[PDB]
A paper describes a structure:
Mosquito toxicity bioassays have revealed that both components in combination are required for activity against Culex quinquefasciatus larvae. Within each Tpp49Aa1 monomer, two distinct domains exist: an N-terminal lectin-like head domain covering residues 49–214 and a C-terminal putative pore-forming domain (PFD) covering residues 215–464. The final model of Tpp49Aa1 revealed the presence of a homodimer forming an “X” structure with a large intermolecular interface, similar to that described for natural heterodimeric crystals of Tpp1Aa2/Tpp2Aa2.
Diffraction data were also collected following mixing with pH 3 buffer. In total, 466,741 diffraction patterns were collected from which 279,362 could be indexed in space group P212121, (a ~ 79.89; b ~ 82.84; c ~ 157.88 Å; α = β = γ = 90, highlighting an increase in unit-cell dimensions in comparison to the pH 7 dataset). Manual building and refinement from the ensembled diffraction data led to a model with Rwork/Rfree of 0.189/0.213 at 1.78 Å. Similar changes in the structure were seen following a decrease in pH from 7 to 3, although this is not physiologically relevant to pH values found in the target insect guts. Briefly, mixing at pH 3 results in a larger increase in overall binding energy at the eight crystal contacts (5.0 kcal mol−1) in comparison to mixing at pH 11 (1.8 kcal mol−1), suggesting that crystals may dissolve more readily at low pH.
Residue numbers in the entry:
A (entry chain B), B (entry chain A): 49 to 464
The structure:
């Protein structure tokens, strides 16, 4: 069940309803370029780089094919299939024109659709109150696309789609699956599921427009053709941090490294202009490129907005554990992992997934069953930041199969 | 499965971290009101109606309890449990103050949470770059709440929640259910399921903040206590428009009224500041009150944004049907209905649901089974607008159990 307008899930041509054969066409022209068919005046001479033409439509020519990326504010970014540049309103020489530019974004790249009736619409420019149409109503002539205010005698701004491309390599979204409880251990030699073997739950997934995905292999002109959307998956799994056999009354010390490394955060930011905020493993910080889509990304990925000024980092805790059972016992200790994975439309992975180990949510598996180890002491060895310096209140019994989540009753600041 | 920040699903008090016992308090004061404890100057005298006080916190006093309604843009509207008024930044006498006002909304009612660490935050008015705190840092004194720019001398603006109310009458959201196919008819006297008996599918459901729900029985001061959110359900069902027994070769004429009446749209607009656009039965138009939440409402209700400048209206079609079967046959004719229902947190219905009859999606049930009636002629008798003036291409066989959806092959403009 995809909650998108039909303009966002296909490519379409854009034409005046008053043109027999002509549609909006991406040009790579310079100022001074002459539109041969045009009557003399402002419509004959190009005044900007990459104006749009009113060109004879060729079936399956990418210069005429546009996709409408839906923003949270009900406006659209309109990208072409030839080079992935977007439409932009621009004033040059006091003439309002439509050009194509790289996604910035800016308010002049945002367009409203106004439907007049079932098959007729207008393209409205945000904040200028102008509508896209053909220069001086030359609907069957080679000339530029302008954006002008409604006046009596202004060129009719009623548009239609002339042709569609529906075979566009839309991704197939994976099904949501719940996080399964870890299996019980079967003997003393059973270390439990390693991180590579642990099943992933798919908690959420969202489409990401290709415009701001810095795919290291596919340039924009190829992304718009083969992967106009990418898929961001929000996955969870139980991440084993250690396992050992303890004799009766055995004590041990472990270094527990949790969170997410600064290099992984920088990679995520470069790739999709999103990082994980320090306020939680499911809390997203958006940059200028991703911000206009933030509520769709949150709603579909089942994440939350971050309120933090700082990125989630790493923390090293030194834990002292004591086997107070009068038995030889296999203990396996797990924290909850949040795994963010980016795929192309063809399902290929773009890089290494971004993983946050959440120290605040933990589970244990034992053999024999229903055993308990005691967390006697926790010390912060180091942290990348001072956002969260809470530790477990000790002593704390960790029992086979019991999930423990940090709250104000079971934790305290490190110096207390 | 509720995708909201914890601040949005509870009430909380707001206090300076530097105050022993004091928290932000809703006042109904006027200019000239004296704050007795305050040092003389701008902090002693109220300069606006409904300033906020730095008051001694009383457990379960609604004047100290605030809920944070999450906007699509990651800002919050902050409402109090006493009277449902919201916080607003205001300049009076060149002093930046926090007041309480009725939800408008305006940009001065929008606040950002800036988290410094796990339990500390600041309240930012983004367009002014001011932060809420206690007048002249009088953190343990009766005085007003101000909003000031960061300067060396400026009162520390670090805040915390002192107390929580988590028992707030959050609604229980119904499960999603699919649209079931209509049962087969069992005999000639079986007219099929009437609209009152037809099972509803729940296609989507969303929380609506009580602030702009004009509940005809609950005033704002009671809504914020008993139903801080309302539930909007998007339901679908098969709506019977007529049923009759036809003899062999019998002809009949029906007036089919479809769409939604102007009075139902006005009621929906008054109640929740939303209407159904003419571009489809699942296409929502938002007014000034609902707009800041539009993407959340769309994503959760599984509707789409409308691009139309006009509301969905009614259309009356005159249909001529012919039983070309050599049998006495019971025919029952259905169109797909979209039903929008509003409930309080306790599950009670707020008024009559808003129904769109979609003439573009239709089904038939017959007895005996696998019979077909012929749609011989369709005429538009009248329509509220000219948005959709398509009719069925005739003759068109309607067969038992076969759903027909309008497309460019099976329909045409009324004059052709």
């Amino acid at each position: 069940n995809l909650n998108l307008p039909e303009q966002s899930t296909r490519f379409q041509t854009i034409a005046s309803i008053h043109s027999n054969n002509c549609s909006f066409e991406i040009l790579n022209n310079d100022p001074g370029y002459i539109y041969g068919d045009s009557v003399d005046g402002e419509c004959r001479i190009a005044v900007a780089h990459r104006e749009l033409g009113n060109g004879l439509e060729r079936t399956g020519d990418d210069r005429f094919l546009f996709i409408f990326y839906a923003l949270d504010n009900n406006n659209f970014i309109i990208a072409n299939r030839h080079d992935g540049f977007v439409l932009q309103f621009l004033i040059a020489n006091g003439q309002g024109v439509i050009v194509s530019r790289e996604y910035q974004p800016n308010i002049h790249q945002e367009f409203t659709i106004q439907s007049i009736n079932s098959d007729t619409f207008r393209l409205h420019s945000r904040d200028t109150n102008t509508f896209a149409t053909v220069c001086w109503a030359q609907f069957n002539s080679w000339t530029k696309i302008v954006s002008r205010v409604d006046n009596p005698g202004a060129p009719n701004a009623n548009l239609k789609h002339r042709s569609l491309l529906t075979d566009i390599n839309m991704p197939q979204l994976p099904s949501l699956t719940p996080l399964q409880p870890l299996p019980r251990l079967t003997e003393l030699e059973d270390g439990g599921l390693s991180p590579a073997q642990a099943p992933r739950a798919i908690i959420g997934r969202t489409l990401i427009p290709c415009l701001f995905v810095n795919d290291p292999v596919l340039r924009l002109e190829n992304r718009i053709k083969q992967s106009p959307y990418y898929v961001l998956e929000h996955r969870q799994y139980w991440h084993r941090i250690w396992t050992d056999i303890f004799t009766a009354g055995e004590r041990r010390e472990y270094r527990e490294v949790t969170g997410i490394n600064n290099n992984a955060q920088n990679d995520m930011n470069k790739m999709i202009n999103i990082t994980i905020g320090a306020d939680g493993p499911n809390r997203l910080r958006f940059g200028n490129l991703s911000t206009p889509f933030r509520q769709q990304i949150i709603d579909n990925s089942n994440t939350l907005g971050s309120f933090a000024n700082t990125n989630y980092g790493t923390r090293t805790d030194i834990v002292n554990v004591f086997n107070s059972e009068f038995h030889q016992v296999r203990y396996a200790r797990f924290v909850k992992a949040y795994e963010y994975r980016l795929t192309r439309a063809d399902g290929s992975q773009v890089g290494t997934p971004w993983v946050v180990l959440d120290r605040k949510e933990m589970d244990l598996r034992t053999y024999p069953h229903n055993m308990a180890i005691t967390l006697e002491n926790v010390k912060i060895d180091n942290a990348d930041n001072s956002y969260d310096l809470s530790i477990w209140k000790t002593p704390l019994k960790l029992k086979d199969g019991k999930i423990i989540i940090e709250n104000h009753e079971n934790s305290k600041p490190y110096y207390n």
